[PDB]
Structures are given as C-alpha cells and as structure tokens.
Design a protein around this nucleic acid. Sequence first.
DNA 1: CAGGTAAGCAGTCCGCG
DNA 2: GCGGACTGCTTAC
Length: 901
Amino acid sequence: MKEFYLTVEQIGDSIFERYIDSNGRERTREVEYKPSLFAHCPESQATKYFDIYGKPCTRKLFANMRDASQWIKRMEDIGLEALGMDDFKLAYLSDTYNYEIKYDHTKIRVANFDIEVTSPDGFPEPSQAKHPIDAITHYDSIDDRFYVFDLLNSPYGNVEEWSIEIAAKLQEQGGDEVPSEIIDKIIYMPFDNEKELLMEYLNFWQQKTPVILTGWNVESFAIPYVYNRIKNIFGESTAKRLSPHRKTRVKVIENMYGSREIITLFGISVLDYIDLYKKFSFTNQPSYSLDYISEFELNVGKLKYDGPISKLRESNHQRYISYNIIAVYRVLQIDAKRQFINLSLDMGYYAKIQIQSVFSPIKTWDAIIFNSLKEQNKVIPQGRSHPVQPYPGAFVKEPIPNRYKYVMSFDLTSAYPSIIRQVNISPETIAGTFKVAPLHDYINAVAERPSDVYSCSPNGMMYYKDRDGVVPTEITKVFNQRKEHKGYMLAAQRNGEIIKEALHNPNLSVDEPLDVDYRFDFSDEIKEKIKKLSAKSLNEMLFRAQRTEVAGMTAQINRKALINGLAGALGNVWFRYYDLRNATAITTFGQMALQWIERKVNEYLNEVCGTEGEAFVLYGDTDSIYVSADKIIDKVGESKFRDTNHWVDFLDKFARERMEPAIDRGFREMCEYMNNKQHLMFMDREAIAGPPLGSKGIGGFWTGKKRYALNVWDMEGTRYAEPKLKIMGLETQKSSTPKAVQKALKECIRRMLQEGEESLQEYFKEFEKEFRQLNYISIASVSSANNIAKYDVGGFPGPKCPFHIRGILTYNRAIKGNIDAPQVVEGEKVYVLPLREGNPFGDKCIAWPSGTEITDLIKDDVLHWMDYTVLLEKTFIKPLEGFTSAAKLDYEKKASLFDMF
DNA sequence: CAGGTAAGCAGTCCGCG
DNA sequence: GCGGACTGCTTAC
Ligand SMILES: Nc1nc2c(ncn2[C@H]2C[C@H](O)[C@@H](COP(=O)(O)OP(=O)(O)OP(=O)(O)O)O2)c(=O)[nH]1
Ligand SMILES: [Ca+2]
Ligand SMILES: [Ca+2]
Ligand SMILES: [Ca+2]
Ligand SMILES: [Ca+2]
Ligand SMILES: [Ca+2]
C-alpha cells in the first residue's frame, strides 16, 4: 500500500513522525529534516523558483530547522521578505507525501476514553488533580474493545468488583442495561490500588498508543486530569509517557475574558468530540452534557441514578462503572451517526496537515495552497502583520411585513466560492483597479463598463483572465467534492420520502428491509418492492435512509463550510493571503448580483403578467430571492387545480422552464458587463410554498429581515410526503427560547400557515390555559453566561448587569457555603427563570447550569416562586404578537355583532 | 482556541416637558 | 412606556 502519516511533530531540529509503512505497519521515525526557505534574487540569476507574482527566488537550504528560524528573524531585522513555508512540519509532509494521500482508517488507532474521579469537595480541578482516578474506560478502534480499569480500594471507599452479568441485565431486573452488542467487547481489569491502575494504564497506552484521541471534554478534563494525577503521584517523566515522544507542553487557551490550561501531547492528535460536534454539527444546543447530546442525537434516555455523583461510587459502584462504559459507547454511537472522525481524517489528509488542524480553516487553506503552489515550483509569500479593519458584507432587502400566500425562492449555488471562480479572485491575479461608480449604477446597468481586458468586481478590482488563480483552482476542487456529497444527501432524502409515502399503506406480512444504496434514487423495481413491505421493514429502511442522509449532510455541509471559510479567510488578518481588496471584491460582487437579479426577475414577471413597476421579489438575503407567485396561480385560477400537489407541480414547472432560463440570461448579461472569466452564477429554485389547497392557511409571513416562516411542499427537488415548515430567525429557531415554548410557537405558526386564524385562536386559548403545568425546565430560558465576575459586586448585581447574570448571582447566594452544590461555569450555559415579587431569593430571577435539574436544596422554592405570568408574556405572547401583527391576524377572537344572539 | 459580515431581540440606563 | 445608545447573545447568510 501507499504510505501515509499518522502524526507529525517538530522537536528542536528533528521531525518526529508516526506513519503507516508500505506493509500497513505502524512505525515511528526521527528525521533531521533540512528545510528550505527563499529570498528574491536578481533577474539574471538562473532559477526554477518564482514567487506567486513571477519574481525569481533563490532557494536557501539550511543545516537545520533552528538555522532556518534564525534566518527568518534576521531577514526581519534587515527588512526583507523571507519566503516559503515557515511551518516546517507542513514542508516535511509535503516532501514526504508528494502524492494524493490514500489512507486506510482501519490502520489508524482511534481511542475513545473517559475517566471517573470521586470528589467530596466539589468539582475535581484537573490542574490540581487532588483526588484518585477510580475508573477509566478506554475504547480502542483497532482491537474493537472497551478496556475497563476499575479502582476497588480508595480513600473514598473500598468496593466490590463490577459484575458484567448484572451490567447486561435490564434496569427492571436491577441491571444497568449495558447494550448487548458491546458486552462481549469489554475487557475488565480491577485494581487493588491507584498506583497499580495508573502504571498498568501507561503500559497499556505504550502498547496501544492513540493516534486520534477523543471522547467527551477529554481536552479540557480527562487528559489534563490524567496527566496531572500521574505527575503528582510519580513525577513529570512518568506523566510524559502519555506522549510517544515523551514531550508535552502546558498550553494556555485564552479568549477575551480569562484563560484555561490544556496539555499538548506531542505525537497524538486530540479531537475532543465536544469540539468536533460544535464545529461540524451545525446545531446550537441549550446544553452540552453528554446526556443531553446523546438524547438529542440518539433518542436514548438519560442515565438515571440516585443521589449526587460524589456518592455514586460508594453507594452503587456497579452502576458507577456501567455508566462510565456506556458514556464511552455513547460517543461512538454519535460518531457512527455523524461521522465527524471520518470527516476530520478526510479533510486533514487532503490538506496534508496535522489532523487536529481541521479546526482551523486558515491553517487548512494555508497548507492546501502551499502544496498546490509547490507543485509548480512556486514560492509562497511571507506572512505579514495587519491591523484588524472592518469591511462590508452582504445586502439584505427590507421586507414589507405581511402574510405572503404563494412563494417561490431561489438562491445561488455556493455563492461566495462561485464568485471567486467567476471573477478569478486570487492574491496573484490582481491586474489593477478601475474608477468605481455608485453600486446602484452597476445594478441598473447605467455605469460605464469597468474593463474591456480584465475580469471585474464593482468594488473597483480587476483580475487577469489568461489563467486561473490558485484560490479559484483549489476552491473548485473542494467545491466539486461538496457537490458530490450533496447529491448523495439529497438522493437519501428523496428516498426517505418514498418510504414515508409507502408507510401509509404497510403490508401485513413478515419480511426484511431491502439491501439498497440509499445514496442513489430508488429504481422502479425497488419502489415496487417497497409498496409490498411491512411497517417494520419500512421503518428500518427509513432509519437507514435517514442515517445515509445524515452522513451525506456531514460530508457536504462541512466542505461547504471549508470553501466559505476561504472567502472569509481573505478578510482574516492571520491568513497568509489576507487582502481586503479581495475580501471586498467578493462581498461587493454579491451585493450587485442580488440586486441585479432582483431587477431582472421583476422585469421578467411584469412582462409575463402585463404589469408595470410591481414588486414580485418581496425579500432577499445575500444571494437569495423570494418571489410572490400569487399572480401566477391566479392566472390559471385555484379552481383549476385537482389538489395541492397539482399546483406545486405547476409552480415547479414554471420555476424550471420559465424562471430559471430568465434568471440565467440575466446573469450571463451581468457576467459580460463585468467581463468575468466564466459565468458561474447558478440561482436554482429552493422552495415552493403555499397553504394547502382549499384551506384558510396563510402560506407564509415575514416580520422583518432574517425573520420569516413558509409552508414548504418541495425543497430543492424533494417532494415531501407532508408539508414542512421552513422557519428562519423566529423564536422557534433560537436555543435561548424555552423548549416547550419553541414547540407551542411552532404549532401556532403551523396553524397560521396551514389552517388559518380560527385554528390559531383555538390553540392559543388552550396553551394559555394549560401552560402552568409544564415542567420547569421546559419553560426556562437559556443563555450563555460570560463575565460573571465583572458584574459581581459583593455577591450582588453591579451596574448594567445582564438579566441572566443577575440570575446566576441570585443562585450563588442561595447555594453559598455549599462545597457540594453545582457551580455555574464561566462561559457555559444556564437555565433562567423569573421570580415573583417577595420571593426568598431576594431578586427577580434565578439561573442554574443548563441540562441539569436545579439542586434539591432550592428546587422546591424555585418551583413555588416561579413567575409563570412573566414567563408567558416574555417568551410566548410577545413573539406571537409579533408573528400575528405581521401576518395581519388575531391570536384572540375579536368581538362581533353575532355575539348579540 | 479554531472562520467572514448583517442584523434581529432582550435587557439596562435614562431621557422625554 | 417607547426610543436611543449600549452590551449581550444569537441567528441568517
Ligand atoms: N465565512 C462564512 N460565510 C458564510 C457562511 N454561511 C454563509 N456564508 C456566506 C458565503 C455563502 O456562499 C453565502 C450564501 O450563503 P448560503 O447559506 O446560501 O451558502 P452557499 O450559497 O455557499 O451554499 P448553498 O449551495 O446555497 O448550500 O453567504 C459561513 O458559515 N461562514
Ligand atoms: Ca462520569
Ligand atoms: Ca446559496
Ligand atoms: Ca440550491
Ligand atoms: Ca403496501
Ligand atoms: Ca441562501
């Protein structure tokens, strides 16, 4: 097989590389890598190296990496550019793997671990590591085994061995319900004392050294705790055995308010699953406890136990250990679904970076572009200092707040990356500038043509047309990948709808799910067999289709995020290719494109309708338009349609056969106007929206910019079995909105859009009547809690104290003195409830850690003093009032003359 | 910690005769 | 109590 790296490090003048050799074996080597850097040289100097601008360079080969780094410093002292890849391990990887890396995941050791630490005096701080580690479960991907290290004797209690037999039993049998599919994969090791446990763990770690290391909060908790505990018991040299090169570094992670400590283990790639999830999931969660996320992702119930975790080991060691094992498995289950590790490996190897660098689009693109340029013997410029400067972004149209019955939307495929490719925007393709006219002059096509030679953006920039820039070239490659995976995602989605349809008429038989590839549209034969299947088989097929869709989603949306990150990186001062001229060329072209096409669509539709000056485009954001289709439907007449699907078909046909060709002609003219390199503005129909045929539903409404709701029947070619709400920006979409309130507001909107005013009034009246029975967690608001200290003045709110911080301070006084009570963690999320006047907490609200029950100490008092009236008005009535006034609708029945009978 | 700008709403402080 | 200046938080792109 072709070799591939696992990890790479620079340690002094050596590269330390772990890799898979040509036989599939893991190896480690130390290489005295001699780096090269570059300086500009005279035109007469014969060379094959040129900077990105075509200026000749001489290569300087250094005796060692320190020599190279010192040379960079001296070049700064002289005042001359030091060119080339200054991150020497990226240069090493580029030299050693001068080919597209094909990796074999089965050979990469992926470790998933979790530790338990009993502590009677509050949260066990990793930097202190003052309490024994009493459990470790460490899953190894190569062995496919859960290795369980269990401390039986501790200063906090001596316990009996964990029983695998009890662990397997149902909760109703007194067991722990450790999933049957992992029972045979557990390797259980009990220990008489902690020193022995840790020594054996380290020997095990040396035998089975993780390449990728993951788990839940491992970077912020498990890794520093294990490192510091071992350091405290045995000394530093022993703790450094966690690194295969015996090198570690305390790394300070700092933001705008305070800092924290993590341990860098050289020769290991740590991908904490919480961070993978936050980056790659495109969710924003009220809580990031593993319990909360597992419930959300997997629909598994929380692991229940009696009493605090600080007493769980002594009271019920059996469950304590079973829960440690299940916690490790839950991360594996989430990954089986989301495939973030696979994503990271894909992106890391593609870029030729340390895998953990996938968190940084700047580093990722720096490496992609360097490797691309190196292929041509071109030489990357030195990174420079730039002051942070604001720059303009997208255009967003101000909508007229209203109901909108029939709506068709369109938006550009990969807008910003497509603009980059179309205009040819790149550091080395800048050709000059032209004298700019006001933006509206380009939008209305009255401005002088910018250039008859170069490709232009209405910010004044001109670009070469003779050859593609490296940014367009490399962005196109990742775009093509994204497009492939999105194809699979949408096929899986359409396949899901077929199954949902079939589930209306399930067959009374015993059978199996069909063995099919859900990434491809079902054939006629498959469709026929599906129509003959049982509910059991259909539901299994739906589950599989939906898992396939999720896998496609992960692969596509994060490749989209990467390419969009390149457009953004051009406006990030830490990017090697930072240039506000290029960043603004993208954003300003986008503003033009949107407003240009708004004009063209209006002109086209006024033509086909025989009107003048009428606004068909009601809204737009960045690269999208929302077109009122009422007059189109009305031109045929509603009574001509057999059912909802009939007019959806008609609008779909109108969009594809009339709208899109007109849109395309408008954009081709714009491309010619700007003299662009290639027409790539592809604005395809997104949504077809409207009320169900014959209903009193309103179809959709807008309250303002970035705040709307649509009843969608077809989304990017997926024809839904049941209408789906596309809701953007409204409170139903915000993690800060109480769970039960999101649900109720969503139902109000569904009723507005699908059923009408009377239906809405019926639901509101019921909700208002019953909501006091809702569980306190379901009606609590959520907020991130930053700067708790700033606003804390002797335990009381300081000037300008935010509402949620006030709540936290109220909580702190209420639990004061308790070493055991859960503390609110700076920067994490809290639940927030308002409190009735004259409550014993002495303030108008209380807040506590999100994803948790409030401590039993005060729970009864919170429940008793909760202000339901305020809660209802702020989270429910006020947003609903916003929706209904916008839609010109009443959520309460107004008086009428009929009342007099 | 890690990636760009636009823009919405909650809430504080305080004016507004 | 609404509106502005401001902070804080959170979404749409
Ligand atoms: N830097 C950055 N830019 C974004 C992000 N989301 C959207 N944008 C910018 C770049 C996009 O091209 C543009 C339009 O947003 P869209 O959500 O419609 O994405 P895009 O057109 O790229 O892909 P699409 O084919 O519509 O799925 O807005 C983001 O998360 N980061
Ligand atoms: Ca635990
Ligand atoms: Ca788009
Ligand atoms: Ca599309
Ligand atoms: Ca059937
Ligand atoms: Ca869009």
